[PDB]
Every structure is written in structure tokens, then in C-alpha cells.
Amino acid sequence: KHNMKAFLDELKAENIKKFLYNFTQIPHLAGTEQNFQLAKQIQSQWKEFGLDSVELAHYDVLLSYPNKTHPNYISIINEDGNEIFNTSLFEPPPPGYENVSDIVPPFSAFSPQGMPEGDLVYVNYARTEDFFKLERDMKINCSGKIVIARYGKVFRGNKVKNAQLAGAKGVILYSDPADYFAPGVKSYPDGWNLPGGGVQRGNILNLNGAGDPLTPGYPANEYAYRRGIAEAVGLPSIPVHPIGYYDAQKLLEKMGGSAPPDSSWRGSLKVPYNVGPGFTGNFSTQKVKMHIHSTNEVTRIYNVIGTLRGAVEPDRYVILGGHRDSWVFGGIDPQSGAAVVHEIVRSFGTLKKEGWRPRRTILFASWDAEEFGLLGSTEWAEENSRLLQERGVAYINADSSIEGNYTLRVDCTPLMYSLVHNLTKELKSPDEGFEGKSLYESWTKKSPSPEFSGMPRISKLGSGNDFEVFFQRLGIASGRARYTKNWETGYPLYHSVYETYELVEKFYDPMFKYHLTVAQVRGGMVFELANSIVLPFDCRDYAVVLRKYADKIYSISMKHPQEMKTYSVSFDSLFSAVKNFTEIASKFSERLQDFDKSNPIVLRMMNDQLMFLERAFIDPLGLPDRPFYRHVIYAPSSHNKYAGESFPGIYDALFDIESKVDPSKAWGEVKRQIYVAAFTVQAAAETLSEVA
Amino acid sequence: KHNMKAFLDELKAENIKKFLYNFTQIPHLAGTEQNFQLAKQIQSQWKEFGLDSVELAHYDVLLSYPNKTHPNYISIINEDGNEIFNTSLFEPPPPGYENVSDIVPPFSAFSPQGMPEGDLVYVNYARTEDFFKLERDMKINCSGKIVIARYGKVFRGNKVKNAQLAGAKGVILYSDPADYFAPGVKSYPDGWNLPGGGVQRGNILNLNGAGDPLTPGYPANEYAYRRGIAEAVGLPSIPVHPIGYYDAQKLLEKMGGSAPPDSSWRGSLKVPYNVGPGFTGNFSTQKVKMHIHSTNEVTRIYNVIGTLRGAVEPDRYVILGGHRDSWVFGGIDPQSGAAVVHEIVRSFGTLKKEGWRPRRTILFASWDAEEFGLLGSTEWAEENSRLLQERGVAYINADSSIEGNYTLRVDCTPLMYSLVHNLTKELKSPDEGFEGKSLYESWTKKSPSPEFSGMPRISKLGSGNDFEVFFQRLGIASGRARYTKNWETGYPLYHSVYETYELVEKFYDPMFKYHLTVAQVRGGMVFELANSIVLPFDCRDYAVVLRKYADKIYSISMKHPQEMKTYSVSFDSLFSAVKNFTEIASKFSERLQDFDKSNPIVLRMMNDQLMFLERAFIDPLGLPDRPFYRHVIYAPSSHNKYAGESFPGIYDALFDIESKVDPSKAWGEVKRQIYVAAFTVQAAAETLSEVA
Ligand SMILES: *[C@@H]1O[C@H](CO)[C@@H](O[C@@H]2O[C@H](CO)[C@@H](O[C@@H]3O[C@H](CO)[C@@H](O)[C@H](O)[C@@H]3O)[C@H](O)[C@H]2NC(C)=O)[C@H](O)[C@H]1NC(C)=O
Ligand SMILES: *[C@@H]1O[C@H](CO)[C@@H](O[C@@H]2O[C@H](CO)[C@@H](O[C@@H]3O[C@H](CO)[C@@H](O)[C@H](O)[C@@H]3O)[C@H](O)[C@H]2NC(C)=O)[C@H](O)[C@H]1NC(C)=O
Ligand SMILES: *[C@@H]1O[C@H](CO)[C@@H](O[C@@H]2O[C@H](CO)[C@@H](O)[C@H](O)[C@H]2NC(C)=O)[C@H](O)[C@H]1NC(C)=O
Ligand SMILES: *[C@@H]1O[C@H](CO)[C@@H](O[C@@H]2O[C@H](CO)[C@@H](O)[C@H](O)[C@H]2NC(C)=O)[C@H](O)[C@H]1NC(C)=O
Ligand SMILES: *[C@@H]1O[C@H](CO)[C@@H](O)[C@H](O)[C@H]1NC(C)=O
Ligand SMILES: *[C@@H]1O[C@H](CO)[C@@H](O)[C@H](O)[C@H]1NC(C)=O
Ligand SMILES: *[C@@H]1O[C@H](CO)[C@@H](O)[C@H](O)[C@H]1NC(C)=O
Ligand SMILES: *[C@@H]1O[C@H](CO)[C@@H](O)[C@H](O)[C@H]1NC(C)=O
Ligand SMILES: *[C@@H]1O[C@H](CO)[C@@H](O)[C@H](O)[C@H]1NC(C)=O
Ligand SMILES: *[C@@H]1O[C@H](CO)[C@@H](O)[C@H](O)[C@H]1NC(C)=O
Ligand SMILES: *[C@@H]1O[C@H](CO)[C@@H](O)[C@H](O)[C@H]1NC(C)=O
Ligand SMILES: *[C@@H]1O[C@H](CO)[C@@H](O)[C@H](O)[C@H]1NC(C)=O
Ligand SMILES: [Ca+2]
Ligand SMILES: [Ca+2]
Ligand SMILES: [Cl-]
Ligand SMILES: [Cl-]
Ligand code: NA
Ligand code: NA
Ligand SMILES: [Zn+2]
Ligand SMILES: [Zn+2]
Ligand SMILES: [Zn+2]
Ligand SMILES: [Zn+2]
Asked: Both ends of chain A: CA-CA distance in Å?
């Protein structure tokens, strides 16, 4: 038989290991020759593996790179102007790689150039609430200061936007051992902890789904018209640079002004974590100075697009996608995912060599420039939006397969909950002490949902990865899955030079059994999605979360009873819409089960309803000021791009509403958002009614 | 057999006459009780005719009405302030109707209230070029003046926008006998000409596809959140009123200042057509004063939606739609169309009673509030956008069946050219002297295309009617057809009380044979569209017009060679895209002919490609500042809503470009629009490539 079990048993841990080792010997930074060569390799091997076509799709996009002859760094400088302290120029390379060249030094991608100088202020995680604390309660003013903030909690881009909206003239990011050093574990090479000389790279854009900063809406092709830098989307206007905890200790040890306001502003370094501004008395006339000489430049990037044509519905597309570019070696991010996708492609190809084809078309992608803002996926989706809108069944992402070795992590649309539950009951748990148990069982035991005894946690999709365009812009049902750590107690070597094949083989997954599990989940999902006769989506799962979401957003609004009375703020229409969806979805399931199994057209009609249901939640006007976030139920949090927010139009219109100077207008906009949500939920529901 | 000929022979001229008489005894103004009652009647009779379901869909939209106890009118007023001249309060009612009540008097719908007073300026047709002439060459300044303009050439809304952007404080519209009185024909009741006391009603919004001014994007339902009047879409900010040529003669006979600049500013009244400002010497201190007391109010409107479920593809929708509301009796506009749709419904129902069903679903609509801005169609499409986007095959409009008795007029998407050519070769010409000839032959002889010997003229779709939302917002293939007058030499009684059943029966179509022809064309189109196994669209027809359009827009740009060199303005990408479309379309036709006729899925795939092709030309970002005009190839002219413009993003960016103060920026935007167009044409083309 050529069935799922066939596909699944053909997958090998050992192949995944080889591929990972092969993908991590040299750096594969976006836009560099080596990442082009790795693209040519994937392309040619997807061809050898049997795909019907494998092409490169290239775009010319805005990237960012340090100046090789003029390095970035930060100083303490004295009243004369002598730089008595310099941050490092590079991370100590790890054992055996100390002669690899082309290790990009730590930098904040897309920082503008500058040499500002001034007094520090320490802003904790640079969250929206951290600035509230700072401005509102503590009365400290960051205007014209240089803020220093620890990584963690939120996407670094948000941090930078917040600092900028607070009047800062520079930002310094560092990794605190409280957030990046697990107790009792050694620093790399002897453990998986971050060393004091380790630094996290990463971009600091606020793109809000735009893709290439120069070409929002349209693929960055050869004739593309490009905005000028000044109209570019998402670029920070103050310089920014990241450092390790050794360098940070030196910047923080002299801090004066006010004490931290409480213990949650305190990391683990032996320093006061005073907030500032400026240094204490003896050193009060010393200053901090940044030297940033990074350049932005339009650079060519290459996606690899593989096609396995479907036998019955070739005009329906299941997409398995993940990126190939890395900040350095990408031992985890992303090559632990890419090696999984490679083996998934190999296994699908093995069946195809024996004459099998999936029912629907499967598209396989190796995206470029993800690290620089999801630019490869997004340009490609901008280019093929019409095909994807009308033919796209689902998108399964495939970035890092592990960030932990404790349990499975799944984030996806409600429409895929049941598929995930089912797939995992059929899969072996790789966990110590669940030998012979199902993956469902181990996952459900180690990671239970808040809502339902006997069910595992499944998160909602945030952003910060290549499914963003497919889900929040286009309304294609999306999911992702990986191994992760204990939810109670990213990973410490995230985006640092220390993230290597040895990191993975020695400390995360020596047997490659977690990787293999993750290949089964990803691959199994894609298999079901590309092969089940009826698409494996359950609309009733959407009905349940919508109720939960409407309860939640109503509760936020109920913190303002007085205002709800004065302005006649009602959630009746939303609750009505969600009830209707529940009823209609339920009648649709009955039909989907009772229908005349033999009829292709009726089957196609009902599959089209399932396929267009996610699509139904798209509003072609977008959310306010974020035209590329069009999904009404899910957007990335406006305070944290990694986190998903439900009913975001309403959440944001309620956020901090008590601080608005014109309440009438603000509550007017809450009501508008309520209407949009109710309408959209009703409209979605109606796509599941009988069609005529 | 139950084939087209069956459908077509069941249609009767005599039934159309009865229905027309039945629809025109009383006024059916949007929002009034009588138009609700006519809706209940249509609904109940579509039920008796056999449709599977017939519902009313209602919305609460902004309308506009004169104050019944405080009438609008215009005065000449003297230095004291005595109103020595008053325009009429109503049109003389026609013979036999002089006791009908509820004849809304002439008014400009959506005019704000006011009593401005000042000197006249006469601005010819109030076209963009007329104001150019006036400001640029003649150096006359309309700021703070009251402009008077004759109807004709362009949509009255544009006229009003132009006057307003010229600083006017009021606008007076009138019908000049040069534009509304055909020589040698009597005034109504004794001919079809407009009498001196006749006046053209009509709205004066600039909605740009928005629908209800208060709820752009979303259906005006019970819980809808509504903008305040001040943020409403499309409302004029100066008062406006329309008058007949008797009243206009009195306003124009005293005009002084400058002479008309040439003979094309001269109508047929015996007055100088001086431009002004103000009156000549003796009367130089007299003034013109408007009294406008119209109110805008949210009012309920009712569409009637009839469904004839398809046997094979019930989830594919062919829509036959036209409006039911009238300014007064609607003898031509719209009941000459509505009576045709009624008979079309009856005939389809006759076949269904005998057990036949169309292959795809047919939806029949009687729209409300078309006269007030296409509001019924648009709200309904806003509400069902998701269904329509994914299931909509085509939309055939059905407003007035005749505006003439000389020949056929067709305006439609290129995709329906071949269907129209074929249908009409099978239809009898109703024309004197083409007895026994085909409709194609008479049409082709009386109305030849500019481009091809042996082919008839087919216009491109403009706007000013209910297909606007379906075509330019949603990208559903649309057409329309009616009898019209000689293209060499609207109709004079357009939007006046004189437009009655007697007008039609006596002077336009005594035999109802032109009506019947138009029912065959409309109905025949809908029949083919709902029944042919392969959708009757030819993508190669799009390829030919795109070349023609690209030649045209290139020629406009070539009036500025110097600027094309300085700014590197190239049309290469557009021409490349159009070539590609041509090639790909051609390969698709070969497949569409060669494919395995027996396979439902392959048939469905290829029909979906045909169906989504029009959809492919939609840009979800819209055109600049006109977010509800999303089609890249066709928009309504920005200077005339009735006329279609091809490549409108580029046309508008080239318009008047030599007057822009920052050429670099302006030519930057030409290039941007070029890129958008090229990209979109390529993307559309690619929807017709093999799918995998
Ligand atoms: C959830 O589904 C129900 C249908 O079972 C929807 O009920 C509809 O609710 C509106 C009120 O918001 C009703 O409007 C009323 O229509 C009558 C004419 O039939 C009119 O006289 C009233 O002034 C009023 O406008 C409507 O009849 C009712 N529709 C049906 C088919 O029963 C409800 O709206 C849905 N919820 C949402 C958010 O869509
Ligand atoms: C019309 O269709 C043709 C395909 O037959 C398109 O040709 C493509 O044109 C672009 C140039 O604009 C070519 O780009 C080049 O790619 C190579 C790598 O293969 C690279 O070295 C060059 O610097 C350059 O970017 C592209 O290869 C060529 N594509 C193919 C498949 O031949 C043309 O773009 C289409 N026109 C439009 C407007 O889309
Ligand atoms: C997940 O698994 C269950 C199999 O238990 C599926 O539910 C059953 O599906 C069949 C229809 O094929 C019905 O006759 C049964 O009544 C269903 N049982 C229950 C409890 O619902 C469910 O369909 C699967 N989900 C997905 C997405 O496949
Ligand atoms: C309009 O009419 C012609 C019928 O002459 C159609 O063209 C023919 O269609 C069949 C495919 O059914 C081909 O085998 C012939 O080769 C075609 N002839 C020509 C000259 O093209 C055309 O398909 C019809 N158009 C539409 C929309 O139906
Ligand atoms: C990866 O594998 C390919 C082919 O098997 C090979 O050409 C290339 O040398 C490999 N890379 C490394 C680092 O071994
Ligand atoms: C890098 O800096 C050096 C001087 O220290 C300079 O010559 C060069 O312009 C810079 N390179 C870029 C790409 O900006
Ligand atoms: C820091 O860097 C600059 C430039 O290389 C130099 O002038 C200064 O001495 C350095 N300071 C220290 C303390 O090493
Ligand atoms: C792998 O397994 C054990 C937990 O059972 C743990 O002690 C070790 O921390 C895990 N490795 C990593 C990198 O989390
Ligand atoms: C139109 O026809 C219907 C039913 O045949 C009837 O109830 C109504 O009276 C008619 N209207 C007129 C003006 O005759
Ligand atoms: C109509 O005008 C009269 C007075 O001349 C006034 O009482 C009334 O307010 C007006 N009606 C409306 C709806 O504005
Ligand atoms: C015009 O109308 C007003 C108000 O009805 C009146 O005072 C005036 O006499 C009228 N003028 C003429 C010339 O009939
Ligand atoms: C109808 O027919 C004849 C032209 O043959 C024409 O003289 C008359 O004007 C036409 N009627 C109208 C309303 O155009
Ligand atoms: Ca882009
Ligand atoms: Ca609306
Ligand atoms: Cl992932
Ligand atoms: Cl029409
Ligand atoms: Na999760
Ligand atoms: Na025409
Ligand atoms: Zn990654
Ligand atoms: Zn990353
Ligand atoms: Zn009309
Ligand atoms: Zn009209």
C-alpha cells in the first residue's frame, strides 16, 4: 500500500542527521554567495529526489550588513572623550570554527548609521508596560537618552519601536543570564547555555506583514518600482546594537538615578539594575557612545520552489515551507527544520518513484531572507497571491524542529486541531517513560490545555515566521510544530555563533528522535492535507474558539462599565454572529458526513467550502494602519509580533482606552470594530450554508 | 428539448408590455412605501413564477429628499432683496397624471442645505477641460461664485466636484435644448422631446464605488456602525439644484462679463451664453439666490433576491440584476429593464415547472436605491462579497432596455465578446429592412467597430449603474445590453416626470419588439452562462484589447519624450506582460479545446480558471485614493463616471502631468503605475498556465 504509514516509515533519523551536518558547516547568510550555492544544492537534490519541477524564484530586496572595514561597537567615554571601554567586535568563535570566515559579527539588522552619545536609561524588557511604568509612575523621561534593554518577552522590533516613540536616540540590546542562562547547565561548548561573550543577532524592523520594505504589495522583481529609503516600510530611525552579558555588566555596573521599581526589573547580573538616567556620582560625567556603520542594500535572494503535482486535484496546493538563510551556522535556526523538510521531500519522492501521487498538489519551499523580515516567503506570496488565494488549501511551516527536548509544541488554526489530535494518536512518543505510548499521550500529559481535561495545549499562531503572509494576509489555513522545552521552566544560543551542529547532536537530540517525531507530525499533516478525500478541517473547532474569544474580549471591555453605558457599547451582535456560526457549522458537518459520497462535484463544492472558510475571515481593508494584516480573528500582537492576539481590531481599540483624551471617539472606534468582527464572523458562517 | 431556443421562444413582447404598464402607474421612489409594495409584488410573483427562493434583503442607508413643506427654488433678486424671478416648484405634470400625488419635485439628491447668493458664472458642461479653459486661458475665477452649467457629456457628480474644487458656492444645472431636444420632434406629450418646464433629477455624489455614504466596506445592517455626516463618503459641500430651459433662459439672458470663448460653449437658447461673472450693466446689481432645504436621512431600502438552484454546479452563480426604484414613474429608467427581467424570470420558471434546471445557479435581483448611488446592489455585494468572490461567474445588468430605437448597444468585458457575437447571429433583427436578417448583421451594419471590418462596436464598461460593485470592486465578469439611438446623431426625457409608459408605447417601442430583442440578448447571455458546459469566455479577446490599451497609454506618455528620457520611463515591462498573456492565453485555449471532455474535475479546474481570470485583474490595494475601484485594467473615468478608462492608474498619473510642480515625483508615480499594471497583467496570465 502507498498510504500514510508508508510515507512515515520511509522517514529516517539518520538522514536528517546527515542533512543537518551538511547544512551547517559554513554560514548561509541571506544574500551571500554561500546561501545561493546552498539553494542550487537543494534545488538539484529535490530534483534527484523526484519532484516534478524545482525552480529558483529570486527577488531583489532591501537587506542590511555591517561594514567589514569599519566595525560597530559601543563605548564608555570620559569627559575628555577617551573611550575607556569598548564592547567586543565579534563573538569568540567556537571550538574548531575559529578559522571559518564570513562569520557576520553581531549586529542589529536595518539599524541606521550613527554615533550618538549620551546617558543611559535602563528600561527592563522595553515592553509597552515597562515604558508605562517608566513614564507614568516613575516620571523618568527617555527623550534624548540611550536606552538599554534586555532581550526577552517580546520581539526586538517592538522594543525598538517603543524606545523610539519614547524619544530615545539609541538602543542597546543585551542578553541577561536571567533570561538566557538555565541554572546548572554549562556555557557552550560544554553545555547549551549562552556564554558572556555570546550575542543574539536579529532584525529590528516593524514591517507588519509588508515584506521587502521597498515594494509593499508587489513582488520585488527586476522592473519593480521601489520606494526611496525615506518612505521605506518598517525601518527604525535610531541606531541599535546588541551585546553579551560581559559587555552589558560593564555598561550597567555604574548606573545611578532611581532604583529599579521592583524585583521583576532585576536580572541576574551582580549590579543594581538602577534605571538611571546616567551613571552614579564618581562617574557621572562619563557617557555611552554607539558607533554604527551598517548599510542597507538591495540584494538578491533565492527561494527554492518544488512541485509534486496531484493526480486528482492538481489545482489545489498544500504547502510545506521553511527558510534556509541563517544568521551564522543555523544549527537549530533554521537547518534543524530544513533537514526535516529535505527528508520529507525524499520520502514523498520515494513513493512517487514507485508510481504514487498525492491527490492534491504539494509545493515545497526553501525560503530566503526570513531572518531579515520574512522577505522571501512574502515576495513570493505577493507574486503568486491570485493562485494562492484561489487554490491554497494549507500552509505548514518548517523552521526549527526543536527549541527544547521536553514536548511537542503546536500552533495552528482551529481548523487543524482535530487533524493534529488524530495524527498524533497514531504516532509513537519519543519521550523517556512513554515508550510504547502515543505522541498524543505524552504531549497531553506534559502540556495540557488550559481549557479541556484530556486535551493538549495548542497555541494560536502569532508571527515572526514565514507563515505570516499565508495566514494573516491571505487567509490560508496554517500550522506549525516543533519540539520545545517545559512551558513552566528563545533557547539560550538563539541567533548566536554557538548555534551549531554540535549543539544539536550533543545536547538537544543525539538520537535525532525528536527531529524524526517532528518530521512525522509535519509530514503527516501535509500528507493528510494533500490526500484525504475530504479536507481534514473541522469548522466546529472554529466555533468553539470564537466563543472563547468573544468571552475574552467582552471581559476586557467590562473593565469599563460606566463607559459601556454612556456610549451604548454592546457585544450582542458579536455573540449573535458566533452563535450563528456554531449552528451553521454544526449543520454543515452533518451534511459533510451525510453527503453522497460518490459525487465528485458535490465533494469539490464541500471541499471548496472548507478551503474558503479560513479565507472568509479576511477583510480586504485590513486592520487599522496595518493593511497587510487582514485576518479579523487573528493578528500579531501590536506589542509583540511573536504573540497572536484574538479579535485584534477590538483588542487594540480597547487597549489603554482610559488614557485617550476623546473617549467618545475611542468608544466609537470600539463599536466600529465590534461591528466589523460580528459582520465578518456572520459572513464566514454563511460560506458554510447551502450554497443555493 | 429544453435548450436555449425553448427559453427564447417562451419570451413574449406582450407580457413585457403588461409588466411595464403594471410597473409605471405610480412613482416608485427609493425609500417610499410604494417601492416597498412593488418589492413585495415582485417577490411574490417570482415565487409564483417558480424560483426556488425569493427573499427581500433590506439595508438602512443614507438617502435624500426635498422638504415637502419648504420647497427648493432659485431666484433673481434685486439690490433691495426682492425676488423678481422664481424658478418652478414642480414640473407640469403630464396628461392624465395631473392628480397623481407623491411626484417628488426636481431636486439634486444629497445637496446640503443653503441659501447662497451671488453672481453667476456659466461654465458650459462643467467638465475638467471647461474649467481649465476658464481658469487657465480666460482667467475667470469661480471662487465665491454660483456656477451654472448645462447637463450633458459627463456625470453630474463630476460637474459638482469640479465646481467645488473651483471655489464655487453653488451650482445650478439645466437642460439645454442643444443637448436634450432633437430637431423636428415634438415636446412631450406629442413627441419625445423635453419641454421647457421639464427637469432632470439625479444624485450628485462622488462615491467612487463606496455604496452607502455612511458604511463604506460593510453592509448597512441593523447594528452597522455609521460614520457621522461629516466623514460621510461622497457628499457635496455646496448646494445644487436642477432647472428646465424656460427657467434657465431667464437666468442666462442677463449674463455679462466675457463672451463665450467659442461656439462649443453655445447652446441653442437665444441668449449670448456669456460666461460672466454677473449680469450686464443695467442689471449688474441683481444677484442669483438658491433656496435649498433638502434633508439627508437614513432610510430603509429593499432588494429582491431570487434563486434558481443549478443541477450540477449550484455553487456557481450567474446574476441577472437591475434596479426597481425610479425618480418618478420610470417608464424607461428602469421599468423598461425590470419588465424584461420579469419576463426572463417567467420564462426560466416555465422550463423549471417542466422539470428543467440550469447547470449553474442563476440569481435574479431587483435592486433598490440605484438612483441614489447604486446603494442596493453595493450593500448586498458588501454583505455577500465572500460568496461572490469565490462563486461568481458573471453579472448581467438590466436597467433600461431602450434609450433609442436605432440599434443594439453592448458594453461588456472582453471575456464575453465572443459569446455576444455568437448569441446575436442566432437572433432575429427587429429592424425595419433587416427582416429575416440576424441581429449581428443589423447591429454590425448600423454600429461598426472602429477596429475591425465586419464586427460591431462593443464598449467597455463605465459606471453609473449596478454592475459597478460586481466588476470594478469584485472582478466578476460583467455585461450589459440595450437598444440605443444612432451613435452619430441620455434620451431627452431622462429622469423627468415625462418618462412614462406612454412615452414608451407611443414613441419608442409600440410593438415591444426592441424590448423583446433585448430580453433575448440579456436572457440568452444568462442562459449560455448558466448552461454551457465550458464557460463561454474567450481569454484571447482579453489579450487583444490589452495590446490596444497598452498602445494607447504608451501614446499618451509619448507626448512627453523629454521627460521620458530624463526619468527613464519605460513601457517595456507592460508590453512584455501583454505578450506573455497573449501567448499563455493561446496555449490555454488549445488545452480547453483538447482536454479530456469526460473528466468533471479537469472541467471544473478549467472553468475555475475562466471564472477567476476576471478576478485576477483585481488589486486588493485599490487605485489611488479610490479603494473600491480595484480592477487594474478598467475604472470609471475620474472626470466622468459614466465612461470607462483603460489602465486608469497610469492614465490618471499621466493626466495633466505637465502642470505638476514636482515632475520627478509625478513621473515616479507614472513608473509605479506602469509596474503595477505590468505585474497585474503577468499575474493574470499566470492564472491560465498549467496549475502544477
Ligand atoms: C444570526 O442569525 C439570525 C437568523 O436566524 C439573524 O436574525 C435576523 O436578525 C435581524 C435583526 O438584527 C432581523 O431583522 C429584522 O427584519 C425584519 C424583517 O424580516 C424587520 O421588520 C426588523 O426591523 C428587523 O430588521 C432579521 O429578520 C433576522 N433574520 C432572520 C432570517 O430571521 C441575525 O441577524 C444573525 N446575526 C448576525 C450578527 O448576523
Ligand atoms: C514574460 O515572460 C518571460 C518568460 O518567458 C519572462 O522572462 C523573464 O525575464 C526576466 C527578466 O526580466 C529574467 O530575469 C533574469 O533571470 C536570470 C536567471 O534565470 C538572471 O540571471 C537575470 O539577472 C535576470 O533577472 C528571467 O530569467 C526570464 N524568465 C524566464 C522563465 O525566462 C518575463 O519577465 C515575462 N514578463 C513579465 C513582465 O513578467
Ligand atoms: C478525527 O478522528 C475521528 C475518527 O474518530 C473522526 O470522527 C469520526 O469520523 C467519521 C466520519 O468519517 C464519523 O462517522 C464518526 O462519527 C466521527 N466520530 C466522531 C467522534 O466524530 C474525525 O473526523 C477525525 N477528524 C479529522 C479532521 O479527520
Ligand atoms: C462562438 O462560436 C464559435 C462557433 O463557431 C466557437 O468556435 C469554435 O468552437 C469549437 C470548440 O467548440 C472548435 O472546435 C472550433 O474550432 C471553433 N471555431 C473557431 C473559428 O474558433 C466559439 O467557441 C464560440 N464562442 C463561444 C464563447 O462560445
Ligand atoms: C552537501 O552535500 C552535497 C551533495 O551530497 C555536496 O556536493 C556538498 O559538498 C555537501 N556539503 C558539505 C559541507 O559536505
Ligand atoms: C566602510 O567604511 C570605510 C572607512 O572606515 C569606507 O571607506 C567605506 O565607505 C565603508 N563602506 C560602505 C559600504 O559604506
Ligand atoms: C576603543 O576603540 C578606539 C578605536 O579603536 C580607541 O581609540 C580606544 O583606545 C579603544 N579603547 C580601549 C579602552 O581599548
Ligand atoms: C534534554 O533532556 C533532559 C531532560 O530530561 C534535560 O536535563 C536536558 O536539559 C535536555 N536538553 C536540553 C537542551 O534541553
Ligand atoms: C400589478 O399586478 C398585480 C398582480 O397581477 C396587482 O396586484 C397590482 O394591482 C398591479 N398594479 C397595477 C397598477 O395594476
Ligand atoms: C421643513 O420645513 C419646515 C418650515 O418651513 C420645518 O418646520 C421643518 O423642520 C422642515 N422639515 C424637515 C424634515 O427638515
Ligand atoms: C418668489 O417667492 C417668494 C416666496 O414665496 C416671494 O416673496 C416672491 O414674491 C416671489 N416672486 C415672484 C416674482 O413671484
Ligand atoms: C423610432 O424610429 C424612427 C427612425 O427610423 C425615428 O424617426 C424615431 O425617432 C424613433 N423613435 C425614437 C424615440 O427615437
Ligand atoms: Ca514586495
Ligand atoms: Ca456599506
Ligand atoms: Cl516552525
Ligand atoms: Cl443596463
Ligand atoms: Na503551543
Ligand atoms: Na457600446
Ligand atoms: Zn528561523
Ligand atoms: Zn531566526
Ligand atoms: Zn436606472
Ligand atoms: Zn436613472
From this structure: 40
Q: Which three cell numbers stand for residue A259?
A: 532604583
Nine cell digits for residue B253: 439672458
How many angstroms is the resolution?
Answer: 2.3
Largest separation between any pair of C-alpha atoms in chain A: 86
Q: Which among B426, B632, B635, B616 is positioned nearest to B539, based on CA atoms?
A: B616
Give the residue range(s) of CATH 3.40.630.10 domains in chain B: 1-66+293-536
> What whole-number distance in Å separates Cα of residue B669 and Cα of residue A138?
48
Told to judge if B370 belongs to the known catalytic residues of this protein, a careful annotator would answer yes
Is the alpha carbon torsion for A400, A406, A412, A415 positive or negative? positive
Grid cell in block for residue B223: 447594528
Q: Where in chain A is the domain with CATH 3.50.30.30?
A: 67-292
Q: Are strands A295-308 and A53-65 parallel, antiparallel or unpaired?
A: antiparallel
Instruction: Give the whole-angstrom CA distance, residue B227 versus residue B606.
Output: 43
Q: Domain A537-692: which topology?
A: Transcription Elongation Factor S-II; Chain A (1.20.930)
Instruction: Give the determination technique.
Output: X-ray
**CB of B610 closer than 6 A to ligand 4?**
no
Per-residue buried b or exposed e for A105-130, using 16+ beta carbons within 10 Å of the residue's own CB: bbbbbbbbebebbbbbbbbbbbbbeb
A 43-62 residues with CB < 8 A to B: 52
CB A216 within 8 A of CB A147: no
CA A340 to each of CA A321, A401, A649, B305, B635: distance values in angstroms, whole numbers, following the listed order: 11, 8, 36, 53, 48
* Residue B182: alpha-carbon gap to chain centroid: 23
Chain B CB contacts of A385 under 8 Å are 620, 683
Q: In angstroms, rounded to a whole number, what is the distance separating the alpha carbons of residues A54 and A44?
A: 8
Q: Is A422 in the pocket of ligand 3 (CB under 6 A)?
A: yes
- Inter-residue contact A520 to A20 (CB < 8 Å): no
Among B680, B420, B683, B395, smallest CA distance to B538 is for B420
Cis omega before residue A277 (within 30°)?
Answer: yes
Nearest 10 degrees: Cα torsion A594, A598, A604, A609: 0
Indicate the angle between helix axes B600-616 and B572-594, nearest 10 degrees: 160
How many Cβ atoms are within 10 Å of A353's Cβ, its own excluded?
9
For chain A, say whether B312 makes contact (Cβ under 8 Å). Answer: yes
The catalytically annotated residue of A253, A426, A608, A619 is A608
Active-site position among A570, A573, A589, A619: A570
C-alpha cell at B677: 499594471
- Ligand 19 centroid–CA B679 distance in Å is 30
Residue A298, φ and ψ in degrees, nearest 5: -75, 130
Question: CATH assignment of A67-292, given 1.20.120.340, 3.50.30.30, 3.20.20.220, 1.10.238.10?
Answer: 3.50.30.30
Contacts of A584 in chain B (CB under 8 A): none
Cβ of B361 and A691 within 8 Å? yes
Report the atom number in ligand 9 closest to the C-alpha of B45: 4
Ligand 4 pocket, residue B590 CB under 6 Å: no
A642 CA: distance to closest CA in chain B (Å):
26
User: Which is the catalytic residue, given B60, B325, B343, B370?
Assistant: B370
Helices (H), B354-402: 375-383, 385-391
Check if CATH label 3.40.630.10 holds for domain B1-66+293-536: yes
Is A87 annotated as ligand-binding? no
Residue B43 contacts residue B49 (beta carbons within 8 Å): no
Question: Does the beta carbon of B602 lie under 8 angstroms from any beta carbon of chain A?
Answer: no
Q: Where are the beta strands (DSSP E) in A42-165?
A: 53-65, 73-77, 83-86, 108-109, 117-118, 120-122, 146-150
CATH 1.20.930.40 boundaries in chain A: 537-692
